[PDB]
Design a protein around this ligand. Structure first.
Ligand SMILES: [Zn+2]
Ligand SMILES: [Zn+2]
Lengths: 49, 214, 233, 58, 116, 49, 56, 273, 280
């Protein structure tokens, strides 16, 4: 989830163990980029489409 | 006088257990005397002051008719309860003389504390008669009544011969049971004597096993 | 660990002579019954004497170490309950740095001696290389802002995990983890950062505090088995 | 609720951009001449006992 | 129990009986020095002992930073500052009672409410 | 007082290359010094230069 | 969801308070050790059980 | 417990105490050696009444002047149901007639026992030096090798309530609670004889004691039970025959042969094997 | 840790992780959680070595034990370990857990399910269960057969309770009789309404003769015959309980063709479950 936001925002994620970073905070940034907050995406089967 | 009552209760239980041992070995013992009430025991095996007399407790047992047919070699059995705690050579010497005098095939000796080595070494001294020593404390509770202990039945010479013949075995190929085994001592097994152990199996209900004394 | 260092040891004699000049009574004239309150002074496990006012000696000894007269690697422990003062100078002891916390009654509560002014010059020297006066880790150590502490000396100090909440005298975001303040007003040191407890291999794991402990151990082993660029030559 | 990025590549530039009365009786003290301190050794004698040991009388 | 020491050689005295007066004497074993005992007790073996409950209390106990603080009232000077600790006996049979030491009068009190 | 804990890291010491080499050099130097004197005894007794 | 987390938080908080309650009485010496156990072992058992149930 | 008193809790305490091993060391705080010149008056304020009680109610000429005193905990003697009468007489029979002992009543504020060693007709001049040493020596023994009651090698006993399914008078199986005693330490031969217990149901964790008390077949059943518990402790289930075959092999020679190099490997099955 | 005060017994001090993995662990919780994990890793390594040695010892002790063609379990020396493998002579691969319907239940339930009477009207058999129900009432020859069956069932209940003191009824047994009955009902499409053509005499004799075909030992002497009877005592109890006169006519409603089919399967299934000689 952090890497997805970092790639979209062109930043380097802060994955240090003990910090104020939370999943909800990362989720808010991800939703601001037009993606589902929890990282789920709608995909299509490659064999049948 | 609480200790006096405790000793009487222990002695009564030991006497009750010894009766079962004689009865199970194949001797004519009636169930009535086996289940002798405690008050009746005090009325017959005590005196005015209360403390019991071990000498009067000694009795004689004879093989029952059924046992004779299966084992036509069993003789009389004499059970003696020693009075004084320390069993010395003198008491043992007269005890062994007592058995040999009246042609007692087997003699059971019940002591309180211990038998000294010089008395014990005299135990194998009157063949073919057999002498067995039992401690009073060990006889207070009958181990055979324990749920874990299965039923042991001694096999006759004919039965043992058929057992080996049908299974085509040898005496060394059978399971072994130690002579000093508490159950073996209870039944008075001898070398080469096989016992049928009929125990309850959770897979087949009843299972019969054989052990040869070693 | 990342910040762990191992001492090289120095001569203990200079410390022993200092103790004698500051009231360390020789052990040859020690009568236990005529002074049943003296503190036993130990240097490298050798009982060199007793001293009547252990508070003043410890304050003087600590001050000298902080300013730089005594080597920082020298470890000093005062067991108040046991009435023993132990000084260790031998090599092989493992120690790590920590912040120093002092009263500083200007704000009325204990606080780190290091301030934003110091951090300003720490970064100034860091970025000027890529010319202000040099200001390195040694300068902090000589200014009494950081202190080397080993396991033996860890026994007689109180350490605050973070200065954000533990040092200040004393809605909440539901996503944030539950933190214990411990409500202690006698802190003597402060961790540089809790994340420094980990080693080289464990420092590459992202969010190792969100993983089960066995998983962190396994990754440390597999990281050493990963293809990469060990050297540019 | 926080910033999940290690902001770099412009914070380095950012930091680089902003940058008594006579109530006493004192006697004179002088050293012993060396003419009598040669070939002579002065030592300290310490009796280890709980009594008062005095060789003059005891 | 109190140990006694000889006067002439510092060796420790041992009990002795005098049938002439039926009394207790403490006599040295080397130099023949005697002294009448002030008490008739000569031996004690406390199987359950409470000695060492507050061992380690010194004039500067409050200077220890690792000790916890509490707001309990001192029932000798009416002060709220104090440092408390558990029993110092390491036998695995002691209670978890806390001993409180006041920083204003050096008075030691306990939180026990069963026996005190 | 409880028996001292043997796992206490404060009672442990780590020997690095310095101390490790010091003991090796100390042992080897002792052998060298012993060999030197053995030469002196041999040289003196056997009348050799 | 938020309501569940609030309930979870209070469940742990209540257990912590209960652990505190047993601790105070143990410090007061009014706690009687369970049969066949010492004062400290009995106190530890009470705390451990309370915390395990809180997680469950 | 006995089938007629399995559900009763009062009988559990009696038997539990009757088997638990307790020593004078566990019910005493301190032992003191005093010097009372005469065995007629006391120096302690507390015992000024006990001597006046026993002496008035009632030889003492040859009693040693050195006194041996014990302080005992009432809370220790009420956790286990004991009275000073039991404790006092126990010391009396420890030394049949060679010391006089006086014990205070329960109503007294502090429980105390006074003991004096009575000297013989002959007078020994060398024993005076070690007279107090002799008191300490007997004092130590009276703390260690004294069995107030119970069975040796039984550290402690704890009671629990198990549920056993027994047929109902109607004919169905209904579970009812019973009182069971769990013990630390094993003395199978002695405990089995203690009155009040059901000797036909006593079980021992160590199948070694079962083998030497009940028999090899009893040991075989006990050995299987222990193996079954260990495998079933983790929840795994293994068919009965697999466990039985291993147990039978371990007991086919009349004794408990181990699975180590000193057991099955000492048989006569070929050197190559 | 050097972060709390001395003599601290709070849950946080002694290693209670109040957070979750999603929320993260505090530095104190992280170390304590790591300490617990190290215990598992050490235990896993040491336990693997200890268990491997134990496994090797067990195999070497029992490597020479095999089931011979006389159904006896013997080692290399020929010494007898078990006179019959597993005390029943069956293969573990053919054992399934089944419930003994006689041991459990109350006495009243036992009578209502097994007792069948043709003289009285308290436990009478409904005439619509079989085509001969009209003429079966008042027949003494069939009544004694039912009486013999019932007493055998009562003996089984007494024996089973004496074997299993706890009263548990679910125990492993070779042949799954319940599945065989289900197959018979569906294979032959039992009407479940029309009375069956089975007779009381056929059912009682059919089950009795089936017990004789359950052969584990085939010796023709008294000793082997006695062992054969004991080896199938528990299985016969299950067989009689399931194949009871009332249960067959009432609970299962089996037809004569179905009943014969069921008996043949039990005989075939039982013979297939016997231990194969030569098994290690
Ligand atoms: Zn002296
Ligand atoms: Zn105060």
């Amino acid at each position: 989830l952090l890497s997805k936001v970092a790639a979209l925002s062109g930043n380097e994620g802060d994955a240090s163990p003990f910090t104020d970073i939370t999943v909800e905070g990362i989720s808010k940034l991800l939703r601001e980029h037009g993606y589902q907050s929890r990282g789920f995406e709608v995909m299509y089967n490659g064999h049948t489409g | 006088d609480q200790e006096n009552e405790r000793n009487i209760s222990r002695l009564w239980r030991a006497f009750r257990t010894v009766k079962e041992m004689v009865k199970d070995r194949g001797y004519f013992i009636t169930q009535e005397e086996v289940e002798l009430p405690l008050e009746d025991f005090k009325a017959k095996y005590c005196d005015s002051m209360g403390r019991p007399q071990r000498k009067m407790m000694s009795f004689q047992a004879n093989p029952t008719e059924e046992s004779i047919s299966k084992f036509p070699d069993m003789g009389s059995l004499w059970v003696e309860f020693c009075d004084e705690p320390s069993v010395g050579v003198k008491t043992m010497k007269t005890f062994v003389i007592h058995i040999q005098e009246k042609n007692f095939q087997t003699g059971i000796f019940v002591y309180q504390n211990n038998i000294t080595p010089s008395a014990m070494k005299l135990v194998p001294s009157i063949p073919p008669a057999t002498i067995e020593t039992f401690n009073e404390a060990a006889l207070v509770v009958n181990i055979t009544h324990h749920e874990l202990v299965p039923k042991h039945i001694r096999l006759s010479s004919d039965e043992k011969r058929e057992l080996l013949k049908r299974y085509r075995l040898k005496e060394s190929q059978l399971p072994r049971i130690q002579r000093a085994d508490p159950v073996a001592l209870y039944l008075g097994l001898k070398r080469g004597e096989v016992v049928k152990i009929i125990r309850k199996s959770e897979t087949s209900g009843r299972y019969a096993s054989y052990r040869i004394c070693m | 660990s990342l910040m762990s260092c191992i001492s090289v040891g120095t001569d203990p004699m200079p410390i022993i002579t200092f103790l004698s000049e500051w009231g360390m009574e020789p052990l040859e004239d020690y009568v236990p019954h005529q002074s049943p309150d003296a503190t036993r002074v130990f240097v490298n496990g050798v009982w060199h004497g007793v001293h009547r006012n252990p508070a003043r000696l410890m304050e003087t000894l600590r001050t000298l170490r902080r300013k730089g007269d005594i080597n920082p690697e020298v470890s000093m422990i005062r067991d108040i309950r046991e009435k023993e003062l132990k000084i260790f100078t031998d090599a092989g002891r493992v120690y790590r740095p920590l912040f120093i916390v002092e009263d500083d009654e200007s704000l009325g509560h204990k606080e780190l001696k290091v301030r934003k002014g110091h951090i300003a010059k720490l970064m100034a020297t860091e970025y000027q290389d890529i010319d202000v006066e040099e200001y390195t880790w040694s300068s902090l150590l000589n200014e009494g802002l950081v202190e080397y502490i080993d396991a033996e000396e860890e026994e007689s100090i109180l350490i605050a995990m973070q200065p954000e909440d533990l040092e200040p005298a004393e809605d909440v975001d539901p996503a944030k983890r539950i933190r214990v303040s411990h409500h202690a007003t006698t802190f003597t040191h402060c961790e540089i950062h809790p994340s420094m407890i980990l080693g080289v291999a464990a420092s590459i794991i992202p969010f190792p505090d969100h993983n089960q402990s066995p998983r962190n151990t396994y990754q440390s082993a597999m990281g050493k088995q990963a293809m990469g660029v060990f050297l540019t030559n | 609720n926080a910033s999940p990025f290690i902001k770099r590549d412009r914070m380095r530039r950012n930091f680089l951009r902003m940058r008594d009365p006579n109530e006493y009786n004192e006697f004179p003290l002088r050293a012993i001449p060396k003419e009598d301190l040669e070939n002579m050794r002065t030592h300290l004698l310490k009796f280890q006992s709980k009594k008062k040991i005095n060789p003059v009388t005891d | 129990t109190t140990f006694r020491f000889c006067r002439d050689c510092n060796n420790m005295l041992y009990p002795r009986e005098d049938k002439e007066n039926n009394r207790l004497l403490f006599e040295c074993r080397t130099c023949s020095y005697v002294e009448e005992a002030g008490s008739p007790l000569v031996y004690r073996h406390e199987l359950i002992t409470n000695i060492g409950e507050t061992a380690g209390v010194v004039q500067d106990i409050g200077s220890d930073p690792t000790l916890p603080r509490s707001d309990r009232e001192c029932p000798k000077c009416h002060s709220r500052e104090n440092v408390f600790f558990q029993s110092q006996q390491r036998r695995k049979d002691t209670s978890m009672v806390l001993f409180f030491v006041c920083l204003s009068c050096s008075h030691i009190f306990t939180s026990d409410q069963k026996n005190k | 007082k409880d028996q001292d804990d043997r796992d206490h890291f404060g009672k442990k010491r780590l020997d690095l290359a310095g101390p490790l080499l010091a003991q090796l050099f100390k042992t080897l130097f002792k052998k060298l010094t012993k060999d030197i004197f053995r030469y002196m005894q041999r040289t003196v007794e056997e009348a050799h230069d | 969801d938020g309501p569940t987390m609030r309930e979870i938080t209070e469940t742990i908080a209540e257990a912590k308070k209960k652990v505190l309650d047993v601790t105070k009485e143990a410090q007061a010496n009014l706690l009687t050790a369970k049969h066949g156990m010492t004062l400290r072992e009995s106190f530890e058992d009470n705390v451990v059980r309370f915390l395990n149930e809180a997680r469950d | 417990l006995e089938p007629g008193h399995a559900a009763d809790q009062e009988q559990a305490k009696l038997i539990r105490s009757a088997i638990e091993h307790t020593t004078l060391k566990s019910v005493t705080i301190a032992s003191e050696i005093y010097y009372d010149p005469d065995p007629r008056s006391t120096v302690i304020p507390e015992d000024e009444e006990i001597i006046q009680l026993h002496f008035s109610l009632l030889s003492f000429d040859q009693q040693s002047p050195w006194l041996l005193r014990l302080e005992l905990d009432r809370a220790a003697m009420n956790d286990k149901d004991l009275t000073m009468g039991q404790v006092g007489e126990r010391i009396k029979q420890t030394f049949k007639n060679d010391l006089f002992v006086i014990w205070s009543e329960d109503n007294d504020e502090k429980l105390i026992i006074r003991c004096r060693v009575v000297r013989p007709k002959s007078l020994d001049a060398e024993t005076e030096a070690e007279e107090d040493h002799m008191l300490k020596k007997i004092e130590n023994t009276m703390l260690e090798n004294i069995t107030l009651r119970g069975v040796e090698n039984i550290e402690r006993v704890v009671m629990m309530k198990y549920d056993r399914k027994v047929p109902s008078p109607t004919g169905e199986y209904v579970k009812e609670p019973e009182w069971v005693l769990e013990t630390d330490g094993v003395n199978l031969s002695e405990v089995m004889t203690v009155p009040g217990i059901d000797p036909t149901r006593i079980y021992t964790n160590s199948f070694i004691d079962i083998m030497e008390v009940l028999g090899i077949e009893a040991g075989r059943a006990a050995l299987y039970k222990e193996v079954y518990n260990v495998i079933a402790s983790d929840g795994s289930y293994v068919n009965y025959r697999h466990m039985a075959l291993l147990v039978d092999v371990m007991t086919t020679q009349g004794g408990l042969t181990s699975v180590t190099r000193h057991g099955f490997n000492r048989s006569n099955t070929g050197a190559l094997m | 840790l050097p972060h709390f005060s001395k003599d601290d017994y709070s849950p946080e001090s002694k290693g209670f992780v109040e957070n979750s993995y999603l929320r993260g662990l505090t530095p104190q919780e992280f170390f304590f959680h790591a300490m617990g994990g190290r215990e598992g890793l050490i235990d896993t390594a040491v336990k693997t070595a200890e268990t491997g040695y134990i496994q090797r010892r067990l195999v070497k002790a029992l490597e020479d034990i095999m089931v011979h063609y006389d159904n006896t379990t013997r080692n290399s020396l020929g010494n007898v370990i078990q006179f019959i493998y597993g005390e029943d002579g069956m293969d573990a691969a053919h054992i399934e857990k089944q419930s003994l319907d006689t041991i459990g239940g109350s006495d009243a339930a036992f009578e209502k399910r097994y007792r069948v009477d043709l003289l009285n009207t308290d436990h009478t058999l409904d005439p619509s269960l079989l085509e001969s129900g009209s003429e079966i009432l008042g027949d003494l020859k069939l009544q004694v057969l039912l009486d013999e069956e019932y007493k055998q069932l009562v003996k089984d209940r007494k024996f089973l309770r004496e074997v299993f003191v706890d009263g548990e009824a679910n125990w492993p047994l070779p042949v799954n009789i319940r599945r065989i009955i289900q197959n018979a009902q569906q294979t032959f499409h039992i009407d479940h309404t029309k009375p069956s053509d089975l007779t009381i005499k056929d059912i009682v004799l059919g089950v009795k003769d089936l017990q004789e075909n359950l052969l584990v030992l085939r010796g023709k002497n008294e000793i082997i015959q006695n062992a054969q009877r004991d080896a199938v005592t528990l299985f016969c109890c299950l067989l009689r309980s399931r194949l009871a006169t009332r249960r067959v006519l009432q609970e299962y409603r089996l037809t004569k063709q179905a009943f014969d089919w069921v008996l043949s399967n039990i005989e075939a299934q039982f013979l297939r479950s016997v231990v194969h000689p030569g098994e290690m």
